[PDB]
């Protein structure tokens, strides 16, 4: 029938295979150890997300500096959202098939304190009973949810790409009461800014802390350094579906 492929079905194939953490099961668990193992995983997850974004039609056509800004602004949204999905498809947290934060690990010192935020995303997906195709449009929009105060360099093209995926999600919803579910799902998107703020707050604070000894891979460290000034000056604009 449709031997010409929908934008959704393209996103379906470009979705990167899920990465293992490499966490050792013989060594005892620790908050120190889990966080570091998670940071390393985070780095490889970002490299995957770059390859992913480049495959999004239109994206590779933005200014290269814009492509950078979008990935720098949105990496945490993408990671947290995908986490929420993984956790929903398997209330626990599936960072990786080999590193699941279960009931017991949750009780580790300083653990649930951050995990509550990531759990929130996961319980929203289960609540709203989100489908896979909806998910793929939502994550795409998450790549496009923040911009600098005075816009991007290819603002027009960006505006048009974003407008495209808003429509794409609308199709996902119907292909599955319409406009209310749209509200619902776009309200979840809006509320990612609040999740990410918390997650980034703890991330930056840990990154900058002298006596904390938690390692970060270079991939993440360059971005964290490249963003701390921007967020602590206010050049970020959070694009909201509802004012």
């Amino acid at each position: 029938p449709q031997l010409t492929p929908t934008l959704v079905s393209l996103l379906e194939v470009i979705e990167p295979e899920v990465l293992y953490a490499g966490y050792d099961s013989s060594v005892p668990d620790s908050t120190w150890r889990i966080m570091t193992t998670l940071n390393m995983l985070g780095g490889r997850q970002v490299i995957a997300a770059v390859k992913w974004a480049k495959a999004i039609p239109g994206f590779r056509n933005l200014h290269l500096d814009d492509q950078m800004t979008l990935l720098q602004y949105s990496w945490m949204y993408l990671m947290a959202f995908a986490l929420g999905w993984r956790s929903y498809r398997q209330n626990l947290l599936c960072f990786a098939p080999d590193l699941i934060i279960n009931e017991q690990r949750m009780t580790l010192p300083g653990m649930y304190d951050q995990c509550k935020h990531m759990l929130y995303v996961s319980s929203e997906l289960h609540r709203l009973q989100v489908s896979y195709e909806e998910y793929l449009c939502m994550k795409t929009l998450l790549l496009l949810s923040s911009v600098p105060k005075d816009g991007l360099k290819s603002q027009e093209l960006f505006d048009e790409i974003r407008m495209t995926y808003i429509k794409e999600l609308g199709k996902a919803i119907v292909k599955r009461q319409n406009w209310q579910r749209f509200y619902q799902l776009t309200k979840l998107l809006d509320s990612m800014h609040e999740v990410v703020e918390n997650l980034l707050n703890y991330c930056f604070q840990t990154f900058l802390d002298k006596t904390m000894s938690i390692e970060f891979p270079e991939m993440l460290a360059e971005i964290i350094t490249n963003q701390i000034p921007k967020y602590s000056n206010g050049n970020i604009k959070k694009l909201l579906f509802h004012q």
Binding site: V50, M68, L71, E222
Partner: peptide
């Protein structure tokens, strides 16, 4: 950040 710039190119 050159590595990202590189991975994007």
């Amino acid at each position: 950040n050159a590595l990202l710039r590189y991975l994007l190119d």
